[PDB]
Amino acid sequence: ARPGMERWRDRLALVTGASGGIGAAVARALVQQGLKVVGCARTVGNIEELAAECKSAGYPGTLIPYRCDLSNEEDILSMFSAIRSQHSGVDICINNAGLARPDTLLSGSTSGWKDMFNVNVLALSICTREAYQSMKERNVDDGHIININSMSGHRVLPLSVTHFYSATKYAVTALTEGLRQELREAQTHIRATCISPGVVETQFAFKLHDKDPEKAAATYEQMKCLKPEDVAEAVIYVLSTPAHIQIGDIQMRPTGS
Amino acid sequence: ARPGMERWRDRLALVTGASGGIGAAVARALVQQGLKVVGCARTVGNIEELAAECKSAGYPGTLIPYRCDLSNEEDILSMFSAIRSQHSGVDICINNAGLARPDTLLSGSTSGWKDMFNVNVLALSICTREAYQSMKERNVDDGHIININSMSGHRVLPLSVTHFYSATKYAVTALTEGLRQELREAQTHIRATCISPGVVETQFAFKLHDKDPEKAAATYECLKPEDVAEAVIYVLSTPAHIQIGDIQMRPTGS
Amino acid sequence: ARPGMERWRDRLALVTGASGGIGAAVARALVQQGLKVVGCARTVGNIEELAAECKSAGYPGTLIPYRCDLSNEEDILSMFSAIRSQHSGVDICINNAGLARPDTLLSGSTSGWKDMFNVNVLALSICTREAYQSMKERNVDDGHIININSMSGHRVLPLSVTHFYSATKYAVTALTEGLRQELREAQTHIRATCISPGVVETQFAFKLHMKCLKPEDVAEAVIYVLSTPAHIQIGDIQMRPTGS
Amino acid sequence: ARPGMERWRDRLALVTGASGGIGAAVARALVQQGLKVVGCARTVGNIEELAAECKSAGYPGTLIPYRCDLSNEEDILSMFSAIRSQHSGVDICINNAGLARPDTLLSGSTSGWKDMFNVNVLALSICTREAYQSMKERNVDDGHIININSMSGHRVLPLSVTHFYSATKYAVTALTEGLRQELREAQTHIRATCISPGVVETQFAFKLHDKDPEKAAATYEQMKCLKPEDVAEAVIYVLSTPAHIQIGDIQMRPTGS
Ligand SMILES: NC(=O)c1ccc[n+]([C@@H]2O[C@H](COP(=O)([O-])OP(=O)(O)OC[C@H]3O[C@@H](n4cnc5c(N)ncnc54)[C@H](OP(=O)(O)O)[C@@H]3O)[C@@H](O)[C@H]2O)c1
Ligand SMILES: NC(=O)c1ccc[n+]([C@@H]2O[C@H](COP(=O)([O-])OP(=O)(O)OC[C@H]3O[C@@H](n4cnc5c(N)ncnc54)[C@H](OP(=O)(O)O)[C@@H]3O)[C@@H](O)[C@H]2O)c1
Ligand SMILES: NC(=O)c1ccc[n+]([C@@H]2O[C@H](COP(=O)([O-])OP(=O)(O)OC[C@H]3O[C@@H](n4cnc5c(N)ncnc54)[C@H](OP(=O)(O)O)[C@@H]3O)[C@@H](O)[C@H]2O)c1
Ligand SMILES: NC(=O)c1ccc[n+]([C@@H]2O[C@H](COP(=O)([O-])OP(=O)(O)OC[C@H]3O[C@@H](n4cnc5c(N)ncnc54)[C@H](OP(=O)(O)O)[C@@H]3O)[C@@H](O)[C@H]2O)c1
Known part of the structure; x- marks a missing residue:
C-alpha cells in the first residue's frame, strides 16, 4: 500500500454515491489500498459489479455494496444501524453523492431545489452526524470525514441551471x-476535509441535462476535464497524511481551464 | 419621502416575516416612505397591529397584513396569487423571514436542519421566483429583490448551535x-441585493435558545431592527443604475 | 444637512486624492454637509477650484487644499503635523487615493508594482495609523476611517492588466x-469601513466626453456610512452598475 | 522517486528561502526526488550545509546554494542570469521566502510593513515573472509555480502583530x-498553485516575536503544530499530479487547532 495508508488497513470507509463517477473511483482506490469499503447508492447493481471487479483484480480490500437512497432519511439511518448491529463502524466517511437539477432561480421547480438540498446538504449532514456518533461510541479519536465539494462552492458561475447547485455547495463549504x-470543541482528533474539483468527466452533466444529452457531451468533449481517478488520488493524499495534519480543502481544476 | 424614494411611491413591496423584529421595522419604514407593503407571517395579529399604528400616525403608505406560513409552498403561491389579483403585483421583495434552531452538526435533529432550510433558503427562493415572475408579466424592468443575509453568511463562527444556520446563510450569499x-441574462434592470447584519436585538436569539432564555438575554444584555430597515431604505433610494450587492454591518466594537 | 450628519458638523475629514473623480465628489459632499475637509493630492489647482466652487455655492463646510505626494512618507507625516497644528486633528480619514497600472504578473514592471503598493496599501496604512494616533491624542472615541476599495478586492477578474492592482485591493480588504x-482591541468606538465599487467612470473618460458607476454614487455611499448612528459599524458596501 | 515525480527528474526547481524552515524542507524533498534545486537565501552557509547533508545521504538530486537577498531586485535578476548561464533555466519556482514583523496597523513602523511587502509580495512577483520568462524562452509548456501562502491569506485573525502580514498573504491569494x-491566456500548460498552511514549527514565530521568544515557544508547545516536512509533502503531491491537473490551493492546519 501507499506510504501513510497502512494505518487505515482493514478499517471501514463509507463511500456514498459509489455506483459511478467520483464515488466509484474513490471506492476502487480505497479497496486497492486495503480498506473495507461500504459503498452505497440507489443503483446497487453497479456497486456489486465494481466489487466483483475488485475481487477479480486481487485487491487487498473488500467492497461491500449497500442499497441506500440518500433522499430518504430512514434509508440512511437503517444503513448506519445495520453497520452498528454488526458490531462495526465507519472510520472514514466520504460524502460524495450529489447532483444538479437544471432549476434556475428565476423559473426553477421547487422539487429540483429540494432534490439538490436533500442529497447535497441534508444527506451529507445526516451521514456526517451518524458517522461521528459511531466513532464516538467506539472511542475512535482519529477518523476522517471528507466532503466532496466543488469549485462551485467557492464562486458562483454565470450558468443559470447550476445556480441553486452552487448554493448547496456554498453550504458544504460552511x-x-x-x-x-x-470536532475541536469535542476535544477529538477526528479530521474534516473538503475536496473542491472543477469539471470532472462523470455522469454528472448527463443527469443535469437529462433532456439534452448533447449539451452534456459538450461540457466534456469541448473542455479538458478532470477524471474521477484524479479526485480519488486527492482523497488518498488526504487520508495518507499523518494524524496531526488536517487538510481543510484541496481546490483543483483541469490545467489551462 | 427621502431623496431617491419618490420613484417607489405607491409601488408594492412584499416583506416576509413582518410580525416582529427586522421585518416589522422594514415594513414600517417602507410605509413611512409611501409604499404599499404586503407584510406576511404566521402571527398576522401583530402585522395588523403595526397597520393601525402606521395608520394612526398618518403615514402616506399602507400596510396590508397577510397570513402566510412560508414553510408551505402552496400557502406562498396562494399569497402571490392574492397579491396579483388584488394588488396587481409585487415590485420589491424583501426576503426577511428566517430562523436558527440549535441543531449542531454532531448531534442536531434533522427536523431542525430541514426547518432552517425550508424558511431561510427554500421560501426565500420561492418568493424570489414568484416576485420575478410578477415583474416579468407586468413588464417591470426596475424591481428590487433584497435578501436578509447575515455576517454568518460570510464566515463560520465557532458556535455549534448556529453552524447549520450559517450554512443556510452561505447558500443565501450564493x-x-x-x-x-x-437578472442580467434576462436583460432586465431588476436589482438584487443582500444585507448582512451582525447581532440584531430581536426575538431571534430567544427562539434559538428556547430551552435557555438566559443565554438569549446574554446575547443582547447590538444593532436594532430600525438599523437594518435604514440599510433597506438606503438600498432602495440608490439611483436605478446602481446595484448594491451587499452591505455588511455589525455593532460598533463587536 | 442629511439626517445623521448633524453630529459631524465642523469636524475634520481628510480626503486623500481629492483633486478629481471619487475623491473630489466625496470632498464636495462632505463640504455640503458642513464638515471641515482637508483634500490632498500631488497638485492642488483642482482642489482650490473646488474649494472656490463650494464657497460660491454657500456650502456650510470648508475645503482646505493640501499638496501631498502619498508615495513619500515624510510628505504624509508633514501633512498630519500641519493638520494637527492648524486644525487640531483628523476625525474622519477617507483613504481614497489609489491607482492601477497595467503591469501584468507575467511581464509587468517592478516600478509599477511598487507604485501601486506604495499608494494603494502603504500610504493607506500610513494615513490610517496617523489618523488613529490623532484621535487617540485628543480622546476622540467615535472617529471613522473609510477605505475606498474595489470589487477587484473581492474577486480576481481575467484581465491581465489589473491583476496586481486586484491583489492590492485584496490587501485593503484584509x-x-x-x-x-x-480599534475594538484598543477599547474604542472608532469605526472602520470599506466601500467597494466596481466600474466607476474615470476622469480620463469624463474629460474625453448603466454600464458604469459615477463618482457621486460612491460619495453617496460615504454619506450613508457616516450618517449611521455611532453604534452601527458598516464593514463593507459592495456596489456595481446594474447593467454590468 | 515517488509515483508522478519521474517526469521532473533532473529538471530545475528554484526554492526561495532555503536556509531553514519550510524552504529547507522543500529543497531537501525535491533533491530526494531527483531534481536539481537552486536554493537561495541570505544565510547561504545553511544551504551549503544542507547540500552537504543531501550529498552525504546519497540523494539522486543536487542542491545548488545561492546567496540572494530577495529585497534587492538586482540580486534576484543576477540569480536568474546565473541559473540561465549555468543551468539552462527554471522549470519549477517555489516562492517560499516570507516573514512577519510585529508592526500593528495602529502603531506599526513603516519599515516593517515595507519589509513584509518586499519579500512576501514583491520578491514573490519578481521571481514568478522571471521564472515564467525563463520557461517562455525555452518553450517550456509544463512548468509549475507554487506560492507558499498561509491560512492568514484567507481569514484575518485578531492578532494585531500579524494584521499587515495577513494582508500580504491576501495579496498572495489574489x-x-x-x-x-x-498562464491560461498565454495558451500554456504552466501550472500555478498555492499551499496555505496554519501554524508550522519553524523560526518564523521566533523572528516575529524577536523581543518575546517565550511567546514563540508557547505557539509551538500549546499543540502539535505542522512541521516543515508536512508542507514539503504537500509540494510533492502538487508536483506529482499528472500534467492535466492543476491544484489551485491546499489549505492545511494542525489537527484539532
Ligand atoms: N462531475 C463534476 O464536474 C463535479 C465537479 C465538482 C464536484 N462534483 C461533485 O462530485 C460528487 C460526485 O458526483 P459525480 O461527478 O461523480 O456525478 P455522477 O457520476 O452523477 O455520480 C453521482 C453519484 O451520486 C449518487 N446519488 C445521486 N443521488 C443519490 C441518492 N438519492 N441516493 C444515493 N446516491 C445518490 C449516484 O448514484 P445512484 O444514481 O445510483 O443513486 C452516483 O453514484 C457530487 O457531490 C458532485 O457535486 C462533481
Ligand atoms: N437578529 C439577528 O441577530 C440577526 C442577525 C443577522 C441576520 N438576521 C436575519 O434577519 C432575518 C429576520 O430575523 P429577526 O432577527 O427579525 O428574527 P425574529 O424576530 O425571530 O423574526 C423572524 C420573523 O420571521 C417570521 N417567520 C419565521 N418562520 C416563518 C414561517 N414559517 N412563515 C412565515 N413567517 C415566518 C416570523 O413570524 P411568525 O412567527 O409570526 O411567522 C418573524 O416575524 C432572518 O433572516 C435572520 O436570519 C438576524
Ligand atoms: N475608477 C474606478 O473604476 C474605480 C473602481 C473601484 C475602486 N476605485 C478606487 O477609487 C479610488 C479613487 O479612484 P478614481 O477612479 O477617483 O481615480 P483617479 O481619478 O485616478 O483619482 C486618483 C486620485 O488619487 C490621487 N493620487 C494618486 N497617486 C497619488 C499620490 N502619489 N499622492 C497623492 N495623491 C495621489 C490623484 O491625484 P493626483 O494625481 O493629483 O496626485 C487623484 O486625486 C482609488 O482607490 C481607486 O483604486 C476606482
Ligand atoms: N511558520 C509558519 O507558521 C507559517 C505558516 C503559514 C505560512 N508560512 C509561510 O511559509 C514561508 C516560509 O516561512 P518559514 O515558516 O519557513 O519561516 P522561516 O523559518 O523564518 O524561514 C523564512 C525563510 O525566508 C528567507 N528570507 C527571509 N527574508 C529574505 C530575504 N530578504 N532574502 C532571501 N531570503 C529571505 C529566510 O532566509 P535568510 O534569513 O537566510 O535570508 C528563511 O530561509 C513564508 O512565506 C511564511 O509566510 C509560515
Whole structure:
C-alpha cells in the first residue's frame, strides 16, 4: 500500500454515491489500498459489479455494496444501524453523492431545489452526524470525514441551471468548516476535509441535462476535464497524511481551464 | 419621502416575516416612505397591529397584513396569487423571514436542519421566483429583490448551535449573486441585493435558545431592527443604475 | 444637512486624492454637509477650484487644499503635523487615493508594482495609523476611517492588466478587517469601513466626453456610512452598475 | 522517486528561502526526488550545509546554494542570469521566502510593513515573472509555480502583530489566481498553485516575536503544530499530479487547532 495508508488497513470507509463517477473511483482506490469499503447508492447493481471487479483484480480490500437512497432519511439511518448491529463502524466517511437539477432561480421547480438540498446538504449532514456518533461510541479519536465539494462552492458561475447547485455547495463549504470546529470543541482528533474539483468527466452533466444529452457531451468533449481517478488520488493524499495534519480543502481544476 | 424614494411611491413591496423584529421595522419604514407593503407571517395579529399604528400616525403608505406560513409552498403561491389579483403585483421583495434552531452538526435533529432550510433558503427562493415572475408579466424592468443575509453568511463562527444556520446563510450569499447573474441574462434592470447584519436585538436569539432564555438575554444584555430597515431604505433610494450587492454591518466594537 | 450628519458638523475629514473623480465628489459632499475637509493630492489647482466652487455655492463646510505626494512618507507625516497644528486633528480619514497600472504578473514592471503598493496599501496604512494616533491624542472615541476599495478586492477578474492592482485591493480588504479588530482591541468606538465599487467612470473618460458607476454614487455611499448612528459599524458596501 | 515525480527528474526547481524552515524542507524533498534545486537565501552557509547533508545521504538530486537577498531586485535578476548561464533555466519556482514583523496597523513602523511587502509580495512577483520568462524562452509548456501562502491569506485573525502580514498573504491569494488566469491566456500548460498552511514549527514565530521568544515557544508547545516536512509533502503531491491537473490551493492546519 501507499506510504501513510497502512494505518487505515482493514478499517471501514463509507463511500456514498459509489455506483459511478467520483464515488466509484474513490471506492476502487480505497479497496486497492486495503480498506473495507461500504459503498452505497440507489443503483446497487453497479456497486456489486465494481466489487466483483475488485475481487477479480486481487485487491487487498473488500467492497461491500449497500442499497441506500440518500433522499430518504430512514434509508440512511437503517444503513448506519445495520453497520452498528454488526458490531462495526465507519472510520472514514466520504460524502460524495450529489447532483444538479437544471432549476434556475428565476423559473426553477421547487422539487429540483429540494432534490439538490436533500442529497447535497441534508444527506451529507445526516451521514456526517451518524458517522461521528459511531466513532464516538467506539472511542475512535482519529477518523476522517471528507466532503466532496466543488469549485462551485467557492464562486458562483454565470450558468443559470447550476445556480441553486452552487448554493448547496456554498453550504458544504460552511458545513465542513463548522464540522472542523465542533470536532475541536469535542476535544477529538477526528479530521474534516473538503475536496473542491472543477469539471470532472462523470455522469454528472448527463443527469443535469437529462433532456439534452448533447449539451452534456459538450461540457466534456469541448473542455479538458478532470477524471474521477484524479479526485480519488486527492482523497488518498488526504487520508495518507499523518494524524496531526488536517487538510481543510484541496481546490483543483483541469490545467489551462 | 427621502431623496431617491419618490420613484417607489405607491409601488408594492412584499416583506416576509413582518410580525416582529427586522421585518416589522422594514415594513414600517417602507410605509413611512409611501409604499404599499404586503407584510406576511404566521402571527398576522401583530402585522395588523403595526397597520393601525402606521395608520394612526398618518403615514402616506399602507400596510396590508397577510397570513402566510412560508414553510408551505402552496400557502406562498396562494399569497402571490392574492397579491396579483388584488394588488396587481409585487415590485420589491424583501426576503426577511428566517430562523436558527440549535441543531449542531454532531448531534442536531434533522427536523431542525430541514426547518432552517425550508424558511431561510427554500421560501426565500420561492418568493424570489414568484416576485420575478410578477415583474416579468407586468413588464417591470426596475424591481428590487433584497435578501436578509447575515455576517454568518460570510464566515463560520465557532458556535455549534448556529453552524447549520450559517450554512443556510452561505447558500443565501450564493443565491443572491446567482440571482444578479440571472437578472442580467434576462436583460432586465431588476436589482438584487443582500444585507448582512451582525447581532440584531430581536426575538431571534430567544427562539434559538428556547430551552435557555438566559443565554438569549446574554446575547443582547447590538444593532436594532430600525438599523437594518435604514440599510433597506438606503438600498432602495440608490439611483436605478446602481446595484448594491451587499452591505455588511455589525455593532460598533463587536 | 442629511439626517445623521448633524453630529459631524465642523469636524475634520481628510480626503486623500481629492483633486478629481471619487475623491473630489466625496470632498464636495462632505463640504455640503458642513464638515471641515482637508483634500490632498500631488497638485492642488483642482482642489482650490473646488474649494472656490463650494464657497460660491454657500456650502456650510470648508475645503482646505493640501499638496501631498502619498508615495513619500515624510510628505504624509508633514501633512498630519500641519493638520494637527492648524486644525487640531483628523476625525474622519477617507483613504481614497489609489491607482492601477497595467503591469501584468507575467511581464509587468517592478516600478509599477511598487507604485501601486506604495499608494494603494502603504500610504493607506500610513494615513490610517496617523489618523488613529490623532484621535487617540485628543480622546476622540467615535472617529471613522473609510477605505475606498474595489470589487477587484473581492474577486480576481481575467484581465491581465489589473491583476496586481486586484491583489492590492485584496490587501485593503484584509487591512480594513484587521483595523476593525485593532480599534475594538484598543477599547474604542472608532469605526472602520470599506466601500467597494466596481466600474466607476474615470476622469480620463469624463474629460474625453448603466454600464458604469459615477463618482457621486460612491460619495453617496460615504454619506450613508457616516450618517449611521455611532453604534452601527458598516464593514463593507459592495456596489456595481446594474447593467454590468 | 515517488509515483508522478519521474517526469521532473533532473529538471530545475528554484526554492526561495532555503536556509531553514519550510524552504529547507522543500529543497531537501525535491533533491530526494531527483531534481536539481537552486536554493537561495541570505544565510547561504545553511544551504551549503544542507547540500552537504543531501550529498552525504546519497540523494539522486543536487542542491545548488545561492546567496540572494530577495529585497534587492538586482540580486534576484543576477540569480536568474546565473541559473540561465549555468543551468539552462527554471522549470519549477517555489516562492517560499516570507516573514512577519510585529508592526500593528495602529502603531506599526513603516519599515516593517515595507519589509513584509518586499519579500512576501514583491520578491514573490519578481521571481514568478522571471521564472515564467525563463520557461517562455525555452518553450517550456509544463512548468509549475507554487506560492507558499498561509491560512492568514484567507481569514484575518485578531492578532494585531500579524494584521499587515495577513494582508500580504491576501495579496498572495489574489496573485496566485491572477497568475493562473494569465498562464491560461498565454495558451500554456504552466501550472500555478498555492499551499496555505496554519501554524508550522519553524523560526518564523521566533523572528516575529524577536523581543518575546517565550511567546514563540508557547505557539509551538500549546499543540502539535505542522512541521516543515508536512508542507514539503504537500509540494510533492502538487508536483506529482499528472500534467492535466492543476491544484489551485491546499489549505492545511494542525489537527484539532
Ligand atoms: N462531475 C463534476 O464536474 C463535479 C465537479 C465538482 C464536484 N462534483 C461533485 O462530485 C460528487 C460526485 O458526483 P459525480 O461527478 O461523480 O456525478 P455522477 O457520476 O452523477 O455520480 C453521482 C453519484 O451520486 C449518487 N446519488 C445521486 N443521488 C443519490 C441518492 N438519492 N441516493 C444515493 N446516491 C445518490 C449516484 O448514484 P445512484 O444514481 O445510483 O443513486 C452516483 O453514484 C457530487 O457531490 C458532485 O457535486 C462533481
Ligand atoms: N437578529 C439577528 O441577530 C440577526 C442577525 C443577522 C441576520 N438576521 C436575519 O434577519 C432575518 C429576520 O430575523 P429577526 O432577527 O427579525 O428574527 P425574529 O424576530 O425571530 O423574526 C423572524 C420573523 O420571521 C417570521 N417567520 C419565521 N418562520 C416563518 C414561517 N414559517 N412563515 C412565515 N413567517 C415566518 C416570523 O413570524 P411568525 O412567527 O409570526 O411567522 C418573524 O416575524 C432572518 O433572516 C435572520 O436570519 C438576524
Ligand atoms: N475608477 C474606478 O473604476 C474605480 C473602481 C473601484 C475602486 N476605485 C478606487 O477609487 C479610488 C479613487 O479612484 P478614481 O477612479 O477617483 O481615480 P483617479 O481619478 O485616478 O483619482 C486618483 C486620485 O488619487 C490621487 N493620487 C494618486 N497617486 C497619488 C499620490 N502619489 N499622492 C497623492 N495623491 C495621489 C490623484 O491625484 P493626483 O494625481 O493629483 O496626485 C487623484 O486625486 C482609488 O482607490 C481607486 O483604486 C476606482
Ligand atoms: N511558520 C509558519 O507558521 C507559517 C505558516 C503559514 C505560512 N508560512 C509561510 O511559509 C514561508 C516560509 O516561512 P518559514 O515558516 O519557513 O519561516 P522561516 O523559518 O523564518 O524561514 C523564512 C525563510 O525566508 C528567507 N528570507 C527571509 N527574508 C529574505 C530575504 N530578504 N532574502 C532571501 N531570503 C529571505 C529566510 O532566509 P535568510 O534569513 O537566510 O535570508 C528563511 O530561509 C513564508 O512565506 C511564511 O509566510 C509560515
